[PDB]
Amino acid sequence: GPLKCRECGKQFTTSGNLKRHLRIHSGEK
Ligand SMILES: [Zn+2]
Numbered sequence: 001g002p003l004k005c006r007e008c009g010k011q012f013t014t015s016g017n018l019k020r021h022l023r024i025h026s027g028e029k
Contacts, residue, residue, distance in 0.1 A: 003018035004011045007025050012018040023029065 001015070002011050002013055003015065005018065005021060005025070007022075012021070
Protein backbone atom coordinates (compact mmCIF):
# COMPACT_ATOMS: atom_id res chain seq x y z
CA GLY A 1 0.00 0.00 0.00
CA PRO A 2 1.33 3.41 -1.08
CA LEU A 3 2.55 5.12 2.06
CA LYS A 4 3.39 8.76 1.47
CA CYS A 5 6.01 10.45 3.60
CA ARG A 6 4.69 14.00 3.85
CA GLU A 7 8.10 15.06 5.16
CA CYS A 8 10.21 13.56 2.37
CA GLY A 9 7.67 13.59 -0.40
CA LYS A 10 8.35 9.95 -1.11
CA GLN A 11 6.03 6.99 -0.83
CA PHE A 12 6.31 3.33 0.14
CA THR A 13 4.20 0.24 -0.29
CA THR A 14 5.35 -1.52 2.86
CA SER A 15 3.98 -0.75 6.32
CA GLY A 16 6.99 -1.62 8.47
CA ASN A 17 9.43 0.32 6.31
CA LEU A 18 7.38 3.52 6.32
CA LYS A 19 6.47 3.09 9.99
CA ARG A 20 10.10 2.72 11.05
CA HIS A 21 10.82 5.52 8.59
CA LEU A 22 8.32 7.89 10.23
CA ARG A 23 9.46 6.63 13.62
CA ILE A 24 12.76 8.38 12.96
CA HIS A 25 10.83 11.36 11.57
CA SER A 26 8.72 11.64 14.72
CA GLY A 27 11.46 10.76 17.18
CA GLU A 28 8.98 8.48 18.90
CA LYS A 29 8.45 4.74 19.15
ZN1 LIG B 1 10.56 10.41 5.18
